[PDB]
């Protein structure tokens, strides 16, 4: 049931999140996942507030409720992390 629930939603894509120090963490998300969950996980692993960071896709700000589908993201796409302005 859980397995059939998962596959209806499709596959995970694997994104690479590149930090200010050029370190890298990959995240798997589904195409309809809100990226706030990625932003929060990344911030949590870096020890900093989420709102101290801005997350860009091809230079565009990623909103909390953006999804990979909305952004046109694909397997192996990159998210860049910068300090909030």
């Amino acid at each position: 049931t859980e397995d059939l629930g998962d596959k209806k939603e499709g596959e995970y894509i694997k994104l690479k999140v590149i930090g200010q120090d050029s370190s890298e963490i990959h995240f798997k998300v589904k195409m309809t996942t809100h990226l706030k969950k990625l932003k929060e996980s990344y911030a949590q692993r870096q020890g900093v507030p989420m709102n101290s960071l801005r997350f860009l896709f091809e230079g565009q700000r990623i909103a909390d409720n953006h999804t990979p589908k909305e952004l046109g993201m694909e397997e192996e796409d990159v998210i860049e992390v910068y300090q909030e302005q």
Partner: peptide
Amino acid sequence: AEERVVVIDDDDAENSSSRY
């Protein structure tokens, strides 16, 4: 530095090899 893959579960985030 070792490879790091985090699964955003939304849903079992344990297995980062997963694709569904």
